[PDB]
Enzyme design. Structure first.
Site, PDB file in Angstrom:
ATOM      1  N   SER A 193      51.981  65.073  22.279  1.00  0.00           N
ATOM      2  CA  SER A 193      51.953  63.740  22.186  1.00  0.00           C
ATOM      3  C   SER A 193      51.441  62.843  23.066  1.00  0.00           C
ATOM      4  CB  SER A 193      53.576  63.435  22.608  1.00  0.00           C
ATOM      5  OG  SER A 193      53.823  63.747  23.989  1.00  0.00           O
ATOM      6  N   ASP A 222      24.301  30.796  65.268  1.00  0.00           N
ATOM      7  CA  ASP A 222      25.298  29.929  65.236  1.00  0.00           C
ATOM      8  C   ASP A 222      26.485  30.908  65.113  1.00  0.00           C
ATOM      9  OD1 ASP A 222      27.046  28.240  64.310  1.00  0.00           O
ATOM     10  OD2 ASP A 222      26.348  27.994  62.165  1.00  0.00           O
ATOM     11  N   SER A 271      32.971  26.692  57.016  1.00  0.00           N
ATOM     12  CA  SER A 271      32.244  27.232  57.975  1.00  0.00           C
ATOM     13  C   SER A 271      32.901  27.993  58.919  1.00  0.00           C
ATOM     14  CB  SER A 271      31.654  25.940  58.960  1.00  0.00           C
ATOM     15  OG  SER A 271      30.468  25.443  58.106  1.00  0.00           O
ATOM     16  N   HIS A 313      28.501  26.080  65.630  1.00  0.00           N
ATOM     17  CA  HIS A 313      28.385  24.806  65.267  1.00  0.00           C
ATOM     18  C   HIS A 313      29.915  24.013  64.860  1.00  0.00           C
ATOM     19  CE1 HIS A 313      28.767  25.956  60.868  1.00  0.00           C
ATOM     20  NE2 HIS A 313      29.365  24.723  60.935  1.00  0.00           N
ATOM     21  N   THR A 326      57.305  69.317  25.569  1.00  0.00           N
ATOM     22  CA  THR A 326      57.285  68.404  26.538  1.00  0.00           C
ATOM     23  C   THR A 326      58.649  68.854  27.507  1.00  0.00           C
ATOM     24  OG1 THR A 326      56.104  66.819  25.408  1.00  0.00           O
ATOM     25  CG2 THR A 326      57.203  65.949  27.746  1.00  0.00           C
ATOM     26  N   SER A 350      51.296  67.413  27.294  1.00  0.00           N
ATOM     27  CA  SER A 350      51.885  67.661  26.071  1.00  0.00           C
ATOM     28  C   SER A 350      51.059  67.222  24.909  1.00  0.00           C
ATOM     29  CB  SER A 350      53.377  67.329  26.073  1.00  0.00           C
ATOM     30  OG  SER A 350      53.730  66.076  26.046  1.00  0.00           O
TER      31      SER A 350
HETATM   32 MG   LIG Z   1      55.052  65.204  24.887  1.00  0.00          MG
END
Ligand SMILES: [Mg+2]
Ligand SMILES: *[C@@H]1O[C@H](CO)[C@@H](O[C@@H]2O[C@H](CO)[C@@H](O)[C@H](O)[C@H]2NC(C)=O)[C@H](O[C@@H]2O[C@H](CO)[C@@H](O)[C@H](O)[C@H]2NC(C)=O)[C@H]1NC(C)=O
Ligand SMILES: *[C@@H]1O[C@H](CO)[C@@H](O[C@@H]2O[C@H](CO)[C@@H](O[C@@H]3O[C@H](CO)[C@@H](O)[C@H](O)[C@H]3NC(C)=O)[C@H](O)[C@H]2NC(C)=O)[C@H](O)[C@H]1NC(C)=O
Ligand SMILES: *[C@@H]1O[C@H](CO)[C@@H](O)[C@H](O)[C@H]1NC(C)=O
Ligand SMILES: *[C@@H]1O[C@H](CO)[C@@H](O)[C@H](O)[C@H]1NC(C)=O
EC number: 3.4.21.43
Length: 490
Positions: A21, A306, A424, A260, A94, A19
């Protein structure tokens, strides 16, 4: 709440106010917010259809839930991007009633097509989200349309979960809070109306609109994106190992960690911050690992191979607090990444690690997610080279590659955080399409900021901090040897 679960179907209807607005720039923010919600909703691999309707004096349906394209994320986002604000130029009032009646009509059409009496119809849960300033001014009270919808959906006390209506004014615009509140559902212990400055704030609120509590299958790399969620909700794969080290759940019984580090494993649990203790059935430590392998020749610590796997003595129950992380080069990761069926491991490495500097993370002792940048290609070489200043641990280093082999990712440059000793074994991971992927695990570095408090090295402090993470893309034969019947490798 919008429920994220395996049983049933979710229809989400996104109603965007075009709309007068709402300026063209406001509408773009609406489109941005709608796209994020679609992207997020599709990240859970649940059964979802998305409608897209724009509205002013009259509604325009860009995507209907009757259409199969509404279940295809790409079609949905495209119908969204193809939404023009000027398509409402001749009716700029709206009419919120009429937007909601458009949803009603769609529901009527769908019920007719499937059958009132069928589980195909009865299993659908419905979530309507209006992006609007809430300034309806024509077409009559929206409550009539709300009440029609509640009727066709047979919303009783037992079926309260089958309908949620949200009204959200996102952006800089002037909003009528009273109408937003009137549009939204009224459910105890929840909010359905929000006023938000930007899409960023909407992302935060949306995490709290989703109820993921009943998603308890082994879906990988799912977490919470809210700054207001717990550490464990944010990284539910994270485990603490008490042999302290960290690890990642990679299935409902297996944990990936560093060799490790070598018992108890502490796993997330929705019932306390303290997690839940698990015993270990089996540990599988890479036989290549020998930290003193090179000691006699002047490389006093060496972290090749590792890597370790722990099988827990019982299966973990999957929850908001305990889930596997996604591993690359699996079919589960392939789906998470939305990549072609016949993708290879090389393709996943390209997918995830394409840039010369890749933002990534690891988890701190205290549970916090910290940031690093993984350095690839030419930047990997420069990143790693500074080990040549570490003359005390590496008194006899002829070539950088004697300590920083191709098995390691590199980070720790500039403003990166650097892992502490007890961090780790924890995942080094990245986020992509709202899913989390483990690309490496914390192994070693040149500076321990913890040796909730971390110290920064002095800018002069030779060598500078730099961190080396076992690269999962380099460990595929070993992972496959041990997890071939646990995970589904490409
Ligand atoms: Mg509106
Ligand atoms: C300093 O590091 C270098 C690089 O690894 C070592 O020299 C290498 O040794 C390997 C076999 O161990 C040999 O095949 C390589 O050609 C050689 N590389 C280079 C660049 O020379 C040193 O190892 C020591 O030096 C001699 C001479 O090369 C070796 O034959 C010897 O085995 C070894 N000395 C002992 C007994 O440890 C290394 N220097 C030290 C003091 O360890
Ligand atoms: C990110 O984490 C958030 C923090 O945990 C999640 O928000 C929580 O969602 C829960 C599930 O919807 C809510 O649970 C409770 O559910 C019961 C019964 O079904 C209701 O009665 C309760 O009112 C409600 N909790 C109570 C006792 O008030 C939590 O309320 C809710 N917490 C907050 C702060 O919003 C997010 O869902 C989560 N998001 C994602 C995407 O994972
Ligand atoms: C608005 O009305 C004019 C005049 O009838 C028409 O030419 C124009 O195409 C209309 N705009 C839209 C988006 O339908
Ligand atoms: C966890 O550690 C991080 C990193 O140092 C710190 O910023 C944060 O304050 C810590 N969290 C708590 C609970 O203090």
């Amino acid at each position: 709440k919008i429920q994220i679960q395996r049983s049933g179907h979710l229809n989400l209807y996104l109603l965007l106010d075009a709309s007068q607005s709402v300026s063209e720039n406001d509408f773009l923010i609406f489109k941005e917010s709608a796209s994020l919600m679609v992207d997020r909703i599709f990240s859970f691999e649940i059964n979802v259809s998305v409608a897209i309707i724009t509205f002013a004096s009259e509604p325009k349906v860009l995507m209907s839930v009757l259409n199969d394209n509404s279940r295809d994320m790409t079609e949905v986002i495209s119908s969204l991007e193809n939404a023009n604000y000027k398509d409402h130029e001749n009716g700029t009032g709206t009419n919120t009633y009429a937007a909601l009646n458009s949803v009603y009509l769609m529901m009527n059409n769908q019920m007719r097509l499937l059958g009132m009496e069928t589980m195909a119809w009865q299993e659908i849960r419905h979530a309507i989200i209006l992006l609007t300033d809430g300034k309806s001014n024509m077409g009559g009270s929206p409550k009539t349309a709300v009440d029609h919808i509640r009727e066709i959906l047979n919303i009783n006390q037992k079926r309260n979960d089958y309908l949620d209506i949200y009204a959200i004014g996102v952006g800089k615009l002037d909003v009528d809070w009273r109408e937003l509140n009137e549009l939204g559902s009224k459910k105890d212990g929840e909010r359905h109306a929000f006023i938000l400055q930007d899409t960023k704030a909407l992302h935060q609120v949306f995490e709290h609109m989703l109820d993921v509590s009943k998603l308890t299958d082994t879906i990988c790399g799912v977490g919470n994106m809210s700054a207001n969620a717990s550490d464990q909700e944010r990284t539910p794969w994270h485990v603490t190992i008490k042999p302290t080290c960290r690890g990642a759940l990679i299935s409902d019984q297996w944990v990936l960690t560093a060799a490790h580090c070598f018992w108890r494993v502490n796993v997330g649990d929705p019932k306390s911050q303290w997690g839940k203790e698990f015993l270990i059935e089996k540990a599988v430590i890479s036989p290549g690992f020998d930290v003193f392998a090179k000691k006699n020749q002047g490389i006093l610590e060496f972290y090749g191979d590792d890597i370790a796997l722990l099988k827990l003595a019982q299966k973990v129950k999957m929850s908001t607090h305990a889930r596997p992380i996604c591993l690359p080069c699996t079919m589960e990761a392939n789906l998470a990444l939305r990549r072609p069926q016949g993708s290879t491991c090389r393709d996943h490495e390209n997918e995830l690690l394409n840039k010369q500097s890749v933002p990534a993370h690891f988890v701190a002792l205290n549970g916090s997610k910290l940031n690093i940048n993984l350095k690839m290609g030419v930047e990997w070489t420069s990143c790693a080279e500074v080990v040549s200043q570490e003359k005390t641990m590496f008194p006899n280093l002829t070539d950088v590659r004697e300590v920083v082999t191709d098995q390691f990712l590199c980070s720790g440059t500039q403003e990166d955080e650097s892992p502490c000793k007890g961090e780790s074994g924890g995942a080094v991971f990245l986020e992509r399409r709202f899913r989390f992927f483990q690309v490496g695990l914390v192994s070693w570095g040149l500076y321990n900021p913890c040796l909730n408090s971390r110290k920064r090295a002095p800018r002069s402090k030779v060598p500078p901090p730099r961190d080396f993470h076992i690269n999962l893309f380099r460990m595929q034969p070993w992972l496959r040897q041990h997890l071939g019947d646990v995970l589904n490798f490409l």
